[PDB]
């Protein structure tokens, strides 16, 4: 189907404790594949998925130099923002940048993204047409006019429609044995005595990829939401994901309830009974 590549940059100032910490992570779909940490000893962009390890020294030098340069220009941007918002030099602040691209099943460009945030709040973003900017306030509007005059959007569009897409296709092909595979959820149920009058049925979905999944309960075929609890999807720590949904039922009525699991890796949805 469709795929995405995303890079997430974070700089965190720490006045009195040296230079800001910069971190970069890169993802393809729900799989992290690179990382950079300015506090780490390596000072290198590093592989975090096996299929990226085959890239040669040129790839690693270039990616390292580029994110290293970002850590350095981020320090300038932090100073600029502090001036824009008239903030003292004593406080700690954060800048975040997200960018990347989506392609369809045919590997062709679908859309591009570039957004920036200061202290967790939107600052500036490239519109979806990749030709103009939207600014969240007047400080950001200052950046917008500057980037308009300098035709910054054109540089981003060239990257997002060209370079970004070309690398994403390459990663998809090189990592196809995993990136283009689905791991269907492994499902089971547990039963827990709440009181003498009630019990909890918990329906589990484990070891699945990608993260997208839907877990629901039915009671004699009727959708149930009351007395249900659905936890947020969480990483197993091995590249796969976990989720569960539970329902409180009158003791003796367990048999009325069915758990339903929908996932990309399932040719048809699962129905689990206790």
């Amino acid at each position: 189907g469709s795929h995405s590549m995303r890079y997430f940059y974070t700089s965190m100032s720490r006045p009195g404790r040296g230079e800001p910490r910069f971190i970069a992570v890169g993802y393809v779909d729900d799989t992290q594949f690179v990382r950079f940490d300015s506090d780490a000893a390596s000072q290198r962009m590093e592989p975090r998925a096996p299929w990226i390890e085959q890239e040669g020294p040129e790839y690693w030098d270039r990616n390292t130099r580029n994110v290293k340069a970002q850590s350095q220009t981020d320090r300038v941007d932090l100073g600029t923002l502090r001036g824009y918002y008239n903030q003292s030099e004593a406080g700690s602040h954060t800048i975040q940048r997200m960018y990347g691209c989506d392609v369809g099943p045919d590997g062709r460009f679908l859309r591009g993204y570039h957004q920036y945030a200061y202290d967790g709040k939107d600052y500036i973003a490239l519109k979806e047409d990749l030709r103009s900017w939207t600014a969240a306030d007047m400080a950001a509007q200052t950046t917008k006019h500057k980037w308009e005059a300098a035709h910054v959007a054109e540089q981003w569009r060239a990257y997002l429609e060209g370079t970004c897409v070309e690398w994403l296709r390459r990663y998809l092909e090189n990592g196809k044995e995993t990136l283009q595979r689905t791991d269907a959820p492994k499902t089971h149920m547990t039963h827990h005595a709440v009181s003498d009058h009630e019990a909890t049925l918990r329906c589990w979905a484990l070891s699945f990829y990608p993260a997208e999944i839907t877990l629901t309960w039915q009671r004699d075929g009727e959708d149930q939401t009351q007395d249900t609890e659905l936890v947020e999807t969480r990483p197993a720590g091995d590249g796969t994901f976990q989720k569960w949904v539970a329902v409180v039922v009158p003791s003796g009525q367990e048999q009325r309830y069915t758990c339903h699991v929908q996932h990309e890796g399932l040719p048809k949805p699962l129905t689990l009974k206790w």
Binding site: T10, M12, D119, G120, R202
Partner: protein
């Protein structure tokens, strides 16, 4: 703005006593990124805990997975302790193999 962390404590694989596993503490939805997360065994800090690389979600809030290999038993209690600027005191969430 400031955002308080959501916390989930759980095992990588379903727990079976004596069987080698990983104890996970997933913290998400927080801002800023400075966060203290410790895994506890019987009320004491576990030594060597690793974590995933810091990343963030659509709303700019951060998320991290802290983890350690462990061998769960009937009686050993595990938990995750989290402190953050949004917290008046550290939040402690017990590990429940049922969840």
């Amino acid at each position: 703005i400031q955002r308080t962390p959501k916390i989930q404590v759980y095992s990588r694989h379903p727990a079976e006593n004596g069987k080698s596993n990983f104890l996970n503490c997933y913290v998400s939805g927080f801002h800023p990124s400075d966060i203290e997360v410790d895994l506890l065994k019987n009320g004491e800090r576990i030594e060597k805990v690793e974590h995933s690389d810091l990343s963030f979600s659509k709303d700019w809030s951060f998320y991290l997975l802290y983890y350690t290999e462990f061998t769960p038993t009937e009686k050993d209690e595990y938990a995750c302790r989290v402190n953050h600027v949004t917290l008046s005191q550290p939040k402690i969430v017990k590990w429940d193999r049922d969840m």
